[PDB]
């Protein structure tokens, strides 16, 4: 396939899937290669550890290990990953690499790639008061229970909620008031991270939601924006499908990618990477009928696709870093 896998080194759950996803965000990968990690101590540095994983994923012929990386951000106990969501790990990783890019020539790469803006509003029904606030986001958690596809998820996510009764809004000078609450999307980022809400609480444990939930290859999002742009419609192309199979923690995590965005899909199952059909990356992961389904999707804005998937060569990795990692290998070999 020309792509290499990642080793199974414990119950790291989504971790390898997310690492392959981030590695094939080529613009992110190049920015990570530029990070000034010469002075870093290797035992403690997450940015250096992500640099290392990416370098190996780009050059290694054998499955890549991840032990230095998990040590660097300190999720080292038997159940450390079972106690966090995939977006929490992504946050830990991207926060580290963007704090490292402060003051550098690649500062802002993470906000530029993954941050969008929305508005959260409260409009009073019986008096004249509307409270607006802008929030940034790096990911979207989409409810699926009782929703047939992504589209109904986005409708449910922007739908109006009612505040009244014993839950009425405190409009300050206006006292308690009846109101509506809601969010609109102001900006959608070039890379769109969508978690699906498949891991829930039952009337008293946690259960997996294996319901059918359709997601498309091409996703139009113009109609969930507050104001659109005719020059850049909000059309996204499906880039990654992170899949879990099973109804409990004894399940198995894999990820399907079309790394180039050209519709040629591969299955990354830890150390095995294999060519797969389009039906097997997408429809076969809808759920419904089994227990195999998507819990997270990555989309790229078509207008930014080629810039986010720009070719990476080995002259993109600075020689200081190639030297440090090759010296690491050379000490490992003695």
Ligand X SMILES: Cn1nc2c(=O)n(CC3(O)CCN(Cc4ccc(-c5ccco5)cc4Cl)CC3)cnc2c1-c1ccc(CNC=O)cc1
For ligand X, which is the closer residue by CB, 4 or 243? Answer: 243
Interface contacts to ligand X, rule CB under 6 A:
14, 85-87, 141, 195, 197-200, 206-208, 244, 248-249, 251, 295-296
Residue 253 corresponds to which tokens in the numbers above?
A: 């995590």
For ligand X, which is the closer residue by CB, 128 or 204? Answer: 204
Q: How far is the CB of 268 from ligand X (least distance, A)?
A: 15
The residue from 13, 90, 124, 276 that is catalytic is 13
What angle (nearest 5°) sits at the alpha carbon of residue 83, between those of residues 78 and 89?
Answer: 100
Q: How far is the CB of 171 from ligand X (least distance, A)?
A: 24
Q: How far is the CB of 213 from ligand X (least distance, A)?
A: 11
For ligand X, which is the closer residue by CB, 36 or 251? Answer: 251
For ligand X, which is the closer residue by CB, 206 or 320? Answer: 206
The residue from 249, 252, 290, 291 that is catalytic is 252
Whether 13 is a known active-site residue: answer: yes
Q: 17 near 66, Cβ under 8 Å?
A: no
Distance CA(226)–CA(117), nearest Å, equals: 11
Distance CA(280)–CA(234), nearest Å, equals: 26
Q: How far is the CB of 46 from ligand X (least distance, A)?
A: 20
The DSSP output letter for 102 is: T
Q: How far is the CB of 246 from ligand X (least distance, A)?
A: 7
For ligand X, which is the closer residue by CB, 86 or 221? Answer: 86
Residue 84 corresponds to which tokens in the numbers above?
A: 């966090």
Among 305, 311, 119, 146, CA closest to 227? 119
Q: 278 near 263, Cβ under 8 Å?
A: yes
Q: 196 near 217, Cβ under 8 Å?
A: no
Question: Could you tell me which residues come within 8 angstroms of residue 332 by beta carbon, excluding any fewer than 6 positions away?
Answer: none
For ligand X, which is the closer residue by CB, 240 or 325? Answer: 240
Among 164, 278, 172, CA closest to 215? 278
Residue 78 corresponds to which tokens in the numbers above?
A: 């038997």
Q: 218 near 239, Cβ under 8 Å?
A: no
Distance CA(223)–CA(98), nearest Å, equals: 31
Whether 105 is a known active-site residue: answer: no
Q: 90 near 139, Cβ under 8 Å?
A: yes
Helix (DSSP H) and strand (DSSP E) numbers for the chain? 10, 16
Active site members: 13, 252
């Amino acid at each position: 396939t020309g792509y290499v896998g990642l080793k199974n080194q414990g119950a790291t759950c989504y971790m390898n899937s997310l690492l392959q996803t981030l590695f094939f965000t080529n613009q992110l990968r190049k920015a990570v290669y530029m990070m000034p990690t010469e002075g870093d101590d290797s035992s403690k540095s997450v940015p250096l550890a992500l640099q290392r994983v990416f370098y190996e994923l780009q050059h290694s012929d054998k499955p890549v290990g991840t032990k230095k990386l998990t040590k660097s951000f300190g999720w080292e106990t038997l159940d450390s990953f079972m106690q966090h969501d995939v977006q929490e790990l992504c946050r830990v990783l991207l926060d580290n690499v963007e704090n490292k890019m402060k003051g550098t020539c690649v500062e802002g790469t993470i906000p530029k790639l993954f941050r969008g803006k929305m508005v959260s509003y409260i409009q009073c029904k019986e008096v004249d008061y509307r409270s607006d606030r802008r929030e940034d986001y790096y990911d979207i958690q989409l409810s699926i229970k009782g929703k047939k596809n992504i589209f109904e998820s986005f409708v449910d996510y922007v739908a109006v909620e009612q505040l009244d009764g014993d839950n009425k809004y405190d409009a300050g000078e206006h006292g308690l008031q009846e109101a509506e609450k809601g969010v609109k999307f102001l900006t959608l980022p070039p890379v769109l991270h969508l978690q699906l809400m498949r891991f829930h609480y039952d009337p008293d444990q946690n259960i997996k939601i294996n319901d059918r939930f359709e997601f498309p290859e091409q996703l139009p999002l113009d109609e969930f924006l507050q104001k659109t742009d005719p020059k850049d419609p909000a059309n996204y192309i499906l880039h990654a499908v992170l899949v879990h199979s099973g109804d409990n923690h004894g399940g198995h995590y894999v990820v399907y990618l079309n790394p180039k965005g050209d519709g040629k899909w591969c299955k990354f199952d830890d150390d095995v990477v294999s060519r797969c059909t389009k039906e097997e990356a997408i429809e076969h992961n809808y759920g419904g009928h089994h227990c195999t389904n998507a819990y997270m999707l990555v989309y790229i804005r078509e207008s930014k696709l080629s810039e986010v998937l720009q070719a990476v060569t080995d002259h993109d990795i600075p020689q200081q870093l190639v030297e440090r990692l090759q010296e690491e290998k050379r000490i490992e070999a003695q």
